[PDB]
């Protein structure tokens, strides 16, 4: 259906099933990995946004 149109916000990166490889990578595989990179809650700290 029409959904959010061009107006309402959406958090589009809902996640799939890719996780971090334990070793070396192809340059082709690296293109897919760039999309999954982020911070937020990935490490404990007293800092805030």
């Amino acid at each position: 259906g029409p959904g959010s149109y061009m107006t309402h916000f959406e958090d589009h990166r809902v996640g799939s099933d890719r996780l971090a490889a334990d070793g070396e990578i192809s340059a082709d595989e690296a293109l897919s990995m760039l999309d999954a990179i982020g911070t937020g809650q990935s490490t404990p700290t007293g800092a805030d946004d």
Partner: protein
């Protein structure tokens, strides 16, 4: 070769016969011609490079 701002005023300017052609020079190189794709992903994880530039380099190495 980029010139002065459009709002510049030519107080004590150079000669009008196009003398002193030695300006507009670029800075020294600060790049490496070959890297690992692991190194590209490490640069992005470190916040030292954009995903845009990282992808661009990987498309040249695949």
């Amino acid at each position: 070769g980029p010139g002065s701002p459009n709002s510049y005023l030519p107080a004590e300017n150079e000669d009008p016969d196009k003398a002193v052609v030695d300006l507009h020079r670029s800075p020294p190189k600060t790049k490496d011609p070959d890297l690992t794709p692991s190194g590209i992903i490490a640069k992005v994880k470190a916040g030292d490079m954009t995903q845009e530039t990282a992808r661009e380099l990987l498309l040249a190495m695949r």
